[PDB]
């Protein structure tokens, strides 16, 4: 039943490639990579990426779960194949994830690029929601994925996604990074990335940073500088931010223990209510300045809208199999606040239940674990789009072979 294949989960934040049947992906590496015209070169594992090198250039291969630059996408694929996978593509099928809102044009183009360039024996393109459901062990339910670019509620029914029920919101890791930037600029915190620091000394809490700048820094572009700053900001997020249990109240937030954090440059300080006031926008964007818009939907609002836009007969199943995934879901008390809001807003007639896949591996790599267990099944061995299928039906056979 098992067959040596290659499972790919190419997200806007990180790419996870590995073999089908393993509990974890072989290699997970950031997606927001740089570029250097050595021709354009790309890197993996973050060790060839976060290096000060001459003329770091900007690039965006995949945004919102969709390919933005086919050249950079092909380069990332080639590098993942020859550097970490270290195996010929013709020896292993390829099961790749895709965003539900991916277009037929991009689907067919990816299919033809995988069949005419790498000559893979079999190909399959599955949706991230279906993969998350298959990983969590449910064929019907609502997948809540809060990535770096968007927070999306996707209803899957019997293993198929209902496009008309999908809902998206831009409040995601990008919004959190913007809020962290604004908080730093308001608190007068100079965001210094590590590559600009030569040495530092220990300073008292709240005092200026005593650090020395490197003397032979190479030429780096504003894009690479912002990438390093966003990496630092994401570290700060994972180390500090926490979701409020209930609706954000300034009085209750001013009674919470502060969290100490030290930036790469040595500036160390404690954060109080400002670390809990930022993650509140994910659930209630009405209190976020610079976001003068009520049409934006919080996490619970997105969930409720996605459940409501579906047939009333299946809403009980969605409410009972609400699955939570994504990187942003790792913020402390995020799922607690989500469950509270969903129990408050959901009609008691429909049972509510959230899966407890709270581990980091279970959350961030859910879409890849799903593809792994889906390709490691004997039944799935009949859904493989073969090279002969591509040659006979053409690029358009993808739409009929893999919904």
């Amino acid at each position: 039943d098992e067959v040596g294949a290659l499972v790919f989960d190419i997200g806007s934040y990180t790419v996870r490639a590995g073999y089908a049947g393993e509990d974890c992906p072989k290699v997970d590496f950031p997606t927001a990579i740089g570029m250097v015209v050595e021709g354009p070169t790309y890197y993996i594992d973050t060790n060839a990426l976060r290096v000060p090198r001459e003329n770091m250039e900007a690039i965006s291969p995949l945004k919102n779960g969709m390919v933005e630059d086919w050249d950079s996408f092909q380069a990332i694929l080639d590098h993942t194949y020859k550097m970490h996978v270290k195996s010929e593509a013709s020896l292993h099928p390829v099961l790749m994830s895709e965003a539900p809102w991916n277009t037929r044009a991009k689907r067919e183009k990816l299919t033809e690029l995988m069949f005419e360039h790498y000559n893979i024996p079999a190909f399959f393109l599955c949706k991230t929601a279906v993969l998350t459901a298959f990983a969590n062990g449910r064929s019907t339910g609502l997948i809540l994925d809060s990535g770096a670019t968007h927070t999306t509620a996707i209803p899957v029914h019997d293993g198929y996604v209902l496009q008309q029920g999908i809902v998206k919101s831009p409040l995601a890791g990008d919004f959190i990074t913007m809020q962290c930037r604004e908080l730093f600029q308001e608190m007068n915190i100079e965001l210094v990335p590590p590559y600009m620091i030569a040495s530092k000394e220990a300073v008292r809490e709240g005092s200026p940073a005593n650090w020395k700048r490197k003397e032979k820094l190479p030429q780096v572009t504003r894009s690479w500088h912002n990438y390093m700053c966003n990496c630092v900001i994401q570290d700060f997020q994972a180390s500090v931010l926490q979701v409020s249990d209930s609706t954000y109240d300034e009085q209750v937030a001013a009674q919470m223990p502060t969290v100490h954090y030290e930036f790469p440059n040595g500036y160390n300080c404690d954060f109080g209510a400002e670390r809990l006031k930022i993650p509140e926008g994910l659930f209630d964007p009405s209190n976020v300045k610079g976001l003068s818009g009520n049409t934006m939907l919080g996490v619970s609002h997105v969930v409720t809208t996605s459940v409501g836009m579906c047939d009333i007969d299946i809403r009980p199943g969605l409410y009972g199999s609400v699955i939570v995934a994504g990187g942003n879901t790792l913020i402390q008390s995020f799922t607690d606040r989500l469950n509270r809001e969903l129990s408050q807003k959901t009609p008691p007639s429909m049972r509510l239940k959230l899966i407890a896949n709270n581990t980091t591996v279970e959350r961030r790599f859910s879409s890849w674990i799903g593809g792994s267990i889906l390709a490691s099944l004997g039944t799935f061995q009949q859904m493989w789009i073969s090279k002969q299928e591509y040659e006979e039906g053409g690029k358009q056979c993808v739409e009929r072979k893999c919904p």
């Binding site: 098992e2 040596g4 996870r16 590995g18 073999y19 049947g21 393993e22 974890c24 992906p25 072989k26 290699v27 997970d28 594992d45 973050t46 060790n47 060839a48 976060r50 290096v51 090198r53 970490h84 270290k86 195996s87 590590p194 620091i197 040495s199 530092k200 220990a202 570290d235 994972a238 180390s239 100490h260 030290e262 790469p264 040595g266 160390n268 980091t360 591996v361 961030r364 790599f365």
Partner: protein, 359 residues
């Protein structure tokens, strides 16, 4: 008792650790090269007859070939067994950094088909290196002879989502040192000659001021030129490669191949690791491998990790006095662990699941 009968085999890019297990030291290590006619030999004989043999390393940054080569190294290692390998074979063999499915299955296939053993186990060299001491986690540098790694093995499990690697500090480091000696005036051009350059690492392996050590030492070159022993008696005061390319680990740009300096590479590994586990990653950073025998690696890793890490988290570096073979020692211990019996794979389950076993 597979624990008492334990056996370990590690291929390696520079020296296979072939030796009987159960004790705390290897027995019959060998250069691990396979020679064939130019127009089969393995080990010391091939290393001697390199002049009339096309030599190959079955280790390609951890990758190996299945049908033809690795079986020769295994036959050469079979001396560790009591010449009765078809009966005395509770062996654990090389586990490349990360090529789990294909390499593990194809290797276990050969092992069970050639020996049909009642005891086998599959664990990445990282976990064996960590068992040399034993604690929550290790981010072992594991700089041996072919590659460098940052394996964050939390609680004895190698988290693959955070494993990072480095390639330039492997074999090509000897070629860079050969080019440095060419600039000096020796001008070697083949392995049969630069074997002595490889040996130079026995003394020319120190670094203090990663940013200006070589310049500051060329300015005051005295009591630092160890004068390695050349065969022809040329004891010229080697005093620049003493500090050039021990630092190439921390500064890949110094060689020409670009990558995160070994220190910042390990740092990025533990950064990509979990937040709470990152404290133990800082506190239990291990150093292992032949390349880690450089006396300055410990202090330089201390300094660089303290510069790159927060002030609250300290760096409790641990370099075993015999880190040369810490991986082998830990593997032998894990093998001859008393109550580890039940975890050995045997012919019993092989005859019904074969390589479809956990891999």
């Amino acid at each position: 008792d597979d624990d008492i009968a334990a056996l370990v085999v590690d291929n390696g890019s520079g020296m296979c650790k072939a030796g009987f297990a159960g004790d705390d030291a290897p027995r019959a290590v060998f250069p691990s090269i396979v020679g064939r006619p130019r127009h089969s030999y393995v080990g010391d004989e091939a290393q001697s007859k390199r002049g009339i043999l096309t030599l190959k390393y079955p280790i390609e940054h951890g990758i190996v070939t299945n049908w033809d080569d690795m079986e020769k190294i295994w036959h050469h290692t079979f001396y560790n067994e009591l010449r009765v390998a078809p009966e005395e074979h509770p062996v654990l063999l090389t586990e490349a950094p990360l090529n789990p499915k294909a390499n593990r299955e194809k290797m276990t296939q050969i092992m069970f088909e050639t020996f049909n053993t009642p005891a086998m186990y599959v664990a990445i060299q990282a976990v064996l290196s960590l068992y040399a001491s034993g604690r929550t986690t290790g981010i072992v540098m594991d700089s041996g002879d072919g590659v460098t790694h940052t394996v964050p093995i939390y609680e004895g499990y190698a988290l693959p989502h955070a494993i990072l690697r480095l390639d330039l500090a492997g074999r090509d480091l000897t070629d860079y040192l050969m080019k440095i000696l060419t600039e000096r005036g020796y001008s070697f051009t083949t392995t049969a000659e630069r074997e002595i350059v490889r040996d130079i690492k026995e003394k020319l392996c120190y670094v203090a001021l990663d940013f200006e050590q070589e310049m500051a030492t060329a300015a005051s070159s005295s009591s630092l030129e160890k004068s390695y022993e050349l065969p022809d008696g040329q004891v010229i005061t080697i005093g620049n490669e003493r500090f050039r390319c021990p630092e190439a680990l921390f500064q890949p740009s110094f060689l020409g191949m670009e990558s995160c300096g070994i220190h910042e590479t390990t740092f990025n590994s533990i950064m990509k690791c979990d937040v709470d586990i990152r404290k133990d990653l800082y506190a239990n950073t291990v150093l292992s491998g032949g390349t880690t025998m450089y006396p300055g690696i410990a202090d330089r890793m201390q300094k660089e990790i303290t510069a790159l890490a927060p002030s609250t988290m300290k760096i409790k570096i641990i370099a075993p006095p015999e880190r040369k073979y810490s991986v082998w020692i830990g593997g032998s211990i894990l093998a001859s662990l008393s109550t580890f019996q039940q975890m050995w794979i045997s012919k019993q389950e092989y005859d019904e699941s074969g390589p479809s076993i956990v891999h």
